A paper describes a structure:
[name] is a homodimer consisting of two domains, an N-terminal DNA recognition domain and a C-terminal Rossmann-like dinucleotide-binding and dimerization domain. The dimerization of [name] is stabilized by the swapping of the C-terminal α-helices and the dimer binds to a consensus [name] OPerator (ROP) sequence (TTGTGAAN4TTCACAA) to repress expression of target genes.
The higher resolution P21 form contained two NAD+ molecules per [name] dimer whereas the P212121 form only contained one NAD+ molecule per dimer. In order to bind to the ROP the DNA binding domain of one of the subunits of the [name]-NAD+ complex must rotate 26.2o. The rotation leads to an increased distance between the recognition helices (α3) from NAD1 (18 Å), NAD2 (15 Å to 34 Å). Similar to a proposed model for B. subtilis [name], binding NAD+ does not lock the protein in the DNA binding conformation, but rather appears to act to increase the rigidity of [name], thereby limiting the conformational flexibility of the protein and stabilizing the interaction with DNA. The allosteric effect of DNA on NAD+ binding observed in this study of GBS [name] supports this idea.
Author numbering:
A (entry chain B): 6 to 212
B (entry chain A): 6 to 144, 146 to 212
């Protein structure tokens, strides 16, 4: 029963509640949460109504309890292994990123063109790089159902389609291209132009 | 007044409307927009009630007129020049990104440690790299926005340096909460939280 726009804030509330927990805060008000997130307290309260919590009275939401609620809903106690497709400027950078404090989110497999110089190599942390033509062979017995897509924009749709045929069910795409994929496939876009336009909008509201 | 959570979608609506316009769609429904964005029609309808005559009906939204609305509210007809601070794995990647079709959003200079090999040089697309100690010298400038891609351990210190030099907004990639003055805006790119969102949605499809 959580609305989709509220669900897109789960992971942000999780981050903030872990911080508040680490800071020894027992009860967090809607205004403190809003301020941390850069939204309005009214949106916070409505959102939290879907998490079982009223926010109109009392001293705040129970930090430990909610933190644990977010952890459970985001499946933060189990591991998700993802593949990275396109090991160029941004893809190579992402191989260096620590996605999770407890390694519950990891890149476990990467792909590039069969002829790319990285193909055949393995990272310091044991992520092999394969050719894209081998993807179906590698995904046969695999636990990976999630891909990060960092190919050139001109190639994103074609590679996305390859991924879905291979069994990928969700894609975190960095290309600024709308992907047309089947309805049961989730695509999450990282759009840094849209992030900067947001930022600038808020900067202009402060002036 | 547009609520802050609605304002965080302006840029997303702008992308969608530019696509619909390019595709020759004259009128869009709340459901078509919601499906594009991956949210609920009801959220779209409420948001658009804050966009004036153009969104009051809750249906048949005029694509060209709303695209123009979003371009105006986002100041998409003028140029924003930004600086990048930290030319490492992700910083160097970003210097290769084309942020805007019409170059209205651009990285115009970058910074690293004074001792970094890239300092004194120019990137592929001819962006100059300077040492962080010289930031206040470089900032007579039109730049009031930074992208922050230093190590996580250095993010707060470098953020403080930016704010002292005159930066008013920071797009941060470090998974570190920054404590800065109220009048400084920080937008956090948090790839962990993006992937958690994606997996939540994937689990809802099963
Ligand atoms: N550069 C950035 O930091 C940044 C930021 C945001 C978005 N983006 C977007 O991310 C995408 C990639 O950008 P980039 O600058 O890293 O591109 P890039 O050109 O450096 O790298 C793309 C990689 O994908 C590989 N590739 C090409 N076809 C492939 C295929 N069929 N299968 C597997 N791999 C294939 C290439 O060999 C290359 O290694 C682009 O759409 C870009 O717009 C980049
Ligand atoms: N690797 C990724 O793709 C990725 C993705 C998401 C988030 N992040 C985050 O982005 C940040 C940077 O990651 P990275 O792997 O690119 O780090 P990195 O160590 O490769 O790069 C950091 C750069 O910052 C420079 N630097 C250090 N102190 C500085 C200072 N005082 N002033 C100016 N420059 C300074 C360094 O010389 C170096 O070039 C980290 O917080 C990381 O968690 C990285
Ligand atoms: Cl949203
Ligand atoms: Mg909302
Ligand atoms: Mg997780
Ligand atoms: Mg090849
Ligand atoms: Mg979505
Ligand atoms: Mg590009
Ligand atoms: Mg653009
Ligand atoms: Mg189910």
């Amino acid at each position: 029963s959580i609305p989709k726009a509220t669900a897109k804030r789960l992971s942000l509330y999780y981050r903030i509640f872990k911080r508040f927990n680490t800071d020894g805060i027992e009860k967090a008000s809607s205004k403190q949460i809003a301020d941390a997130l850069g939204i309005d307290s009214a949106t916070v309260r409505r959102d939290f109504s879907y998490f079982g919590e009223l926010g109109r009275r009392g001293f705040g939401y129970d930090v430990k309890k909610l933190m644990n609620f977010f952890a459970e809903i985001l499946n933060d106690h189990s591991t998700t292994n993802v593949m990275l497709v396109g090991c160029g400027n941004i893809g190579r950078a992402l191989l260096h990123y620590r996605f999770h404090d407890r390694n519950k989110m990891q890149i476990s497999m990467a792909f590039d063109l069969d002829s790319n110089d990285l193909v055949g190599k393995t990272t310091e942390d044991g992520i092999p790089v394969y050719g894209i033509s081998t993807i179906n062979d590698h995904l046969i017995d695999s636990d990976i159902e999630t891909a990060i897509l960092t190919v050139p924009s001109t190639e994103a749709q074609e590679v996305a389609d390859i991924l879905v045929k291979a069994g990928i069910k969700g894609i975190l795409s960095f290309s600024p291209v709308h992907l047309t994929l089947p309805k049961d496939i989730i695509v999450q876009y990282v759009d840094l132009t849209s992030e900067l336009q947001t930022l600038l909008y808020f900067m202009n509201q402060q002036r």
